[PDB]
Amino acid sequence: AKILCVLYDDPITGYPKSYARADVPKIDHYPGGQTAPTPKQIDFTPGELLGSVSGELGLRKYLEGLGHTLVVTSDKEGEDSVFERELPDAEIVISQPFWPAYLTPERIAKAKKLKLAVTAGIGSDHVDLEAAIKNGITVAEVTYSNSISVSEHVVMMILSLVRNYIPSYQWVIKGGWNIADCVERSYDLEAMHVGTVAAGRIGLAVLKRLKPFDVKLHYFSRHRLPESVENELGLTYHPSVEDMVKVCDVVTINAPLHPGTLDLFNDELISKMKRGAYLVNTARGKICNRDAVVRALESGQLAGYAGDVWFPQPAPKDHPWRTMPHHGMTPHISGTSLSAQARYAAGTREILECWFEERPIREEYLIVDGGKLA
């Protein structure tokens, strides 16, 4: 069978010949007890670059040893792309959210042999689930594999926005000291009100990391956390997002992209935030209306915005989030740290072994299975 695997390009300086450190820590399990991926073998050393074209997610020796073929490409856009030309023959398609091969209804129709679509990462909004359901395609993602990685990125970005890190760094490089210039927009985070949209694997990890900063914590969720958790973390529950954002100095978005969160932070909702609020979004770019965020930063309604997720991906050269004032953006990188790559690459192989050995894929990895939502 044919496996079609879309990855981002190598660094412009070539695939790395060395790394800054000798190894990465061993992660055995996630908070709550889900075990780390359990592939039978791996053909990489954790810490290597796996999600670029030369990395191949460590999959070629395994797949070709079984007689299957593996096509790796970064060329994913349009009908003339390698991805779309190779799609009609593929039993399995793999891509990462960071450089996503969108499986639209049209492409799924053309993918006559497609039976398994794997998200190397978390969040399968690039896959049209209705068409996958219609066509009996299994959709899997590597649940929890980089949730902690994102929670780290969130707190990092919150601190940098509030404490005005990046403009202060720039004064060093420019040859200046300029203390007053740095701190005329520098605050402590301590005792601010911080709220999260969703308290899932990322959102809860964010709340736990924020707690010892002595912030006043808020959250909005469809379902409440156990009261024992709310008490230990000092959480205030809000039954609507509007209610929460009214009182928050900082808001972090940690919910998946779906109809209920598409365009949720539009002009109206952002106008309900505190003036000078900070907004962080490492969830899915489209949960925030692109031009509304730009306008709120230009007016001062938002004091700062940061995240790693954009619409579309890759972001075009003229994307307005590149140049809006007071931002601390990165490209979509938090979920593909070298540490996270090791976990989602192991998980991708685990899923593939289960697929080819006719053993069940972990229930926690499954998004649709056997023609229905999991």
**C-alpha span between 146 and 151 (Å, rounded):** 9
The token pair at 341 is 């790559």
Active site residue 146: yes
313 belongs to the catalytic site:
yes
Residue of 332, 341, 343, 349 marked active site: 332
Active site residue 29: no
- Return the range that interacts with ligand NAP (CB under 6 A); candidates 105-113, 171-179, 252-260, 348-356: 252-260
334 binds ligand NAP (CB under 6 A): yes
Work out how close the CB of 348 gets to ligand NAP at its nearest, in angstroms, rounded to a whole number. 15
The count of residues in the chain is 374
Q: Please choose, out of 47-55, 126-134, 143-151, 156-164, the segment that lies near ligand NAP by the rule CB under 6 A.
A: 143-151
- What minimum distance in Å lies between the beta carbon of 368 and ligand NAP? 15
With binding defined as CB under 6 A, does residue 245 bind ligand NAP? no
CA distance readout (Å), 240 to 147, 221, 339: 24, 8, 35
Site for ligand NAP in 260-289 (CB under 6 A): 260-261, 282-284
Q: Does 254 bind ligand NAP (CB under 6 A)?
A: yes
Residues 6+ apart with CB under 8 A from 22: 47
For ligand NAP, the binding residue among 16, 200, 314, 331 (CB under 6 A) is 200
d(CA 144, CA 165): 30
- ∠ CA 13-335-251 to the nearest 5 degrees? 125
Degrees, nearest 5: CA angle 328-19-284: 35
C-alpha dihedral (12, 16, 17, 23), degrees to nearest 10: 160
33 counts as binding ligand NAP under rule CB under 6 A: no
- The answer to whether residue 197 forms part of the interface with ligand NAP (CB under 6 A) is yes
User: What is the Cα gyration radius of the chain?
Assistant: 21
Binds ligand NAP by CB under 6 A, chosen from 37, 58, 123, 304: 123
Contact residues for ligand NAP, defined by CB under 6 A: 122-123, 146-147, 150, 197-198, 200-203, 220-223, 254-257, 260-261, 282-284, 308-309, 332, 334-335
